[PDB]
Design a protein around this ligand. Structure first.
Ligand SMILES: CNCc1ccc2c(c1)C[C@H](CNC(=N)N)[C@H]2NC(=O)C(=O)Nc1ccc(Cl)c(F)c1
Ligand SMILES: *[C@@H]1O[C@H](CO)[C@@H](O)[C@H](O)[C@H]1NC(C)=O
Ligand SMILES: *[C@@H]1O[C@H](CO)[C@@H](O)[C@H](O)[C@H]1NC(C)=O
Ligand SMILES: *[C@@H]1O[C@H](CO)[C@@H](O)[C@H](O)[C@H]1NC(C)=O
Ligand SMILES: *[C@@H]1O[C@H](CO)[C@@H](O)[C@H](O)[C@H]1NC(C)=O
Ligand SMILES: *[C@@H]1O[C@H](CO)[C@@H](O)[C@H](O)[C@H]1NC(C)=O
Ligand SMILES: *[C@@H]1O[C@H](CO)[C@@H](O)[C@H](O)[C@H]1NC(C)=O
Ligand SMILES: *[C@@H]1O[C@H](CO)[C@@H](O)[C@H](O)[C@H]1NC(C)=O
Length: 335
C-alpha cells in the first residue's frame, strides 16, 4: 500500500556484498522491536498477492545488479560488458519495515496456509530477518514451520500454480567443489530426506485423497529449473536432483526410488559460467571458478513443486518471487 524500508544488521566493514549493499540501502535494526498481539481481530491475508513480495524482489534485483556483476550481460539485442571480479558473497538477513503511519500485520496462527482469514494477529514495525536466498527446487536457509508441514498454493486445483511446501524440520544439504574444475557434488542423508518426503506425502495426501503420491525429477526447462541451482560463495551451482525427487507414497508409506550409497544421496553438480537470469529474460556470463574448495552447508527448509489414479509432483522454481513469498506469507501492510 506504501513503500517500505529495510533494516539490516550489516557492517560498513565487511566487503561481503550483501553487507555493502545493505549499509547503503538499509537502516539499522531496532534492538527491541515492538509487537502488539490482538487475538480477537481476525484479518485476511493472501500471500500470492502481496506487494511486500514485489518490493523485496526489486531490492534483491538491485542487490544482485550491484554485487554480482557479470562479465557479459545479454538482454535482447544488447550485450553489456563490465568488470566481473570475484567477490565474497554470503546472504545476510533483511527486515522489511513499515514507514511512519503504517504497520505490518503478522498472522500468528502456526498452521496458516498463507490465504484467507487468520484469527490471532499482531502488529509490528518490521518483518523478521529474511535471507534473500536465490535458488530453484529447494528453498534454503529459510525459517521452518512451527508445528506441521504447511502446503501453500494459490490454487491446488490449478496444476500450473507453484506449490510451496514449508518444512517443520530442516534437511541438511552440503555442496562442495573440492580442491573437473567445474565438477561438484551435494550430500544429503537419505534417512532424513526419506522421513521428510514421507511426511510431505502425508500432507499432499490430505489434499488429494484418492490418489497415489509420486515424486519424479523435473521434466523440462532450462538447466536452472531442471536442476537445483543456487549461488555458493559467488559461484553458480547446478545440482542434479533425479535421485532426490524419485519416490512413491502409496499406502500411508513412502518408498524412495532414487539411488543412495552408505545412506547418502549424492547429487552430481556443475559450476557454470553462462547463466539464464532470474531477474529478467537474458543471459549472464561470469568468470571461471575461484580456486580452493567451494563449500556451502545449507538447511533445506522448503520445496517448490509442480503437479502434473496418481498425482505426480516434480521440483519447480524459476520465479524468485515464490522464494520471497515463502517467507513473507504471514505479513500484510495496513493503514
Ligand atoms: C515454472 N515456470 C515459471 C518460470 C520458469 C523459469 C523462469 C521464470 C518463470 C522467470 C525466469 C525468466 N528468466 C529467463 N528466461 N532468463 C526463469 N527463471 C530463471 O531463469 C532462473 O531462475 N535462473 C537462475 C539463475 C541463477 C540462479 Cl542461482 C538461480 F537459482 C536461477
Ligand atoms: C488455504 O486455506 C483456505 C481457508 O483459509 C482455503 O480456502 C484454501 O483452499 C487453502 N489452500 C491450501 C493450499 O490449503
Ligand atoms: C511435522 O509435520 C508432520 C506432518 O505435517 C508431522 O507428522 C510431524 O510430526 C511434524 N514433526 C515435527 C518434528 O514437528
Ligand atoms: C482453482 O482451480 C480451478 C482452475 O483449474 C478453478 O476451479 C478455479 O480457478 C479455482 N478453483 C478453486 C476451487 O479455487
Ligand atoms: C540428471 O542425471 C540423469 C542421470 O544421471 C540424467 O538422465 C539427466 O538428464 C540429468 N539431468 C540434468 C538436468 O542434467
Ligand atoms: C530414480 O533413480 C534411478 C537411478 O537411481 C533412475 O534409474 C530412475 O530413472 C529415477 N526415477 C525417475 C522417475 O527418473
Ligand atoms: C530411508 O533411508 C535409509 C538410509 O538409507 C534406509 O535405510 C531406509 O530404508 C529408507 N527408507 C525408505 C526408503 O523408506
Ligand atoms: C546457508 O547458511 C549457511 C550458514 O550461514 C551458509 O554457510 C550457506 O552457504 C548458506 N547457503 C546458501 C546457499 O546461501
Amino acid at each position: 500500500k506504501t513503500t517500505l524500508f529495510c533494516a539490516s544488521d550489516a557492517k560498513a566493514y565487511e566487503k561481503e556484498v550483501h553487507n555493502v549493499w545493505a549499509t547503503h540501502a538499509c537502516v539499522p535494526t531496532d534492538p527491541n522491536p515492538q509487537e502488539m498481539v490482538l487475538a480477537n481481530v481476525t484479518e485476511n491475508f493472501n500471500m500470492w498477492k502481496n506487494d511486500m513480495v514485489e518490493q523485496m524482489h526489486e531490492d534483491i534485483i538491485s542487490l544482485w545488479d550491484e554485487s554480482l556483476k557479470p562479465c557479459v550481460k545479454l538482454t535482447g539485442g544488447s550485450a553489456i560488458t563490465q568488470a566481473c571480479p570475484k567477490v565474497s558473497f554470503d546472504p545476510i538477513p533483511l527486515h522489511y519495515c513499515a514507514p511512519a503511519g503504517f504497520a505490518i500485520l503478522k498472522c500468528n496462527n502456526k498452521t496458516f496456509n498463507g490465504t484467507g482469514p487468520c484469527r490471532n494477529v499482531s502488529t509490528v514495525q518490521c518483518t523478521h530477518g529474511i535471507k534473500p536466498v536465490v535458488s530453484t527446487q529447494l528453498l534454503l536457509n529459510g525459517s521452518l514451520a512451527e508445528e506441521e508441514i504447511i502446503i501453500r498454493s494459490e490454487n491446488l486445483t490449478n496444476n500450473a500454480k507453484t506449490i510451496i511446501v514449508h518444512l517443520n524440520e530442516s534437511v541438511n544439504i552440503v555442496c562442495t567443489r573440492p580442491n573437473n574444475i567445474r565438477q561438484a557434488h551435494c550430500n544429503i542423508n537419505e534417512s532424513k530426506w526419506n522421513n521428510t518426503l514421507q511426511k510431505v506425502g502425508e500432507e499432499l495426501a490430505k489434499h488429494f485423497p484418492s490418489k497415489t503420491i509420486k515424486f519424479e525429477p523435473s521434466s523440462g526447462g532450462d538447466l536452472e529449473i531442471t536442476t537445483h541451482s543456487f549461488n555458493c560463495r559467488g559461484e553458480f551451482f547446478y545440482c542434479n536432483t533425479s535421485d532426490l525427487f524419485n519416490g512413491t507414497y502409496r499406502n500411508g508409506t513412502y518408498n524412495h526410488t532414487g539411488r543412495s550409497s552408505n545412506g547418502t544421496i549424492t547429487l552430481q553438480c556443475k559450476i557454470k559460467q553462462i547463466i539464464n537470469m532470474w531477474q529478467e529474460v537474458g543471459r549472464a556470463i561470469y568468470a571461471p571458478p575461484i580456486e580452493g574448495e567451494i563449500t556451502c552447508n545449507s538447511n533445506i527448509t522448503g520445496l517448490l513443486l509442480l503437479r502434473d489414479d496418481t498425482e505426480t509432483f516434480r521440483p519447480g522454481g524459476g520465479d524468485m518471487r515464490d522464494n520471497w513469498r515463502s517467507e513473507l506469507y504471514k505479513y500484510k501492510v495496513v493503514e
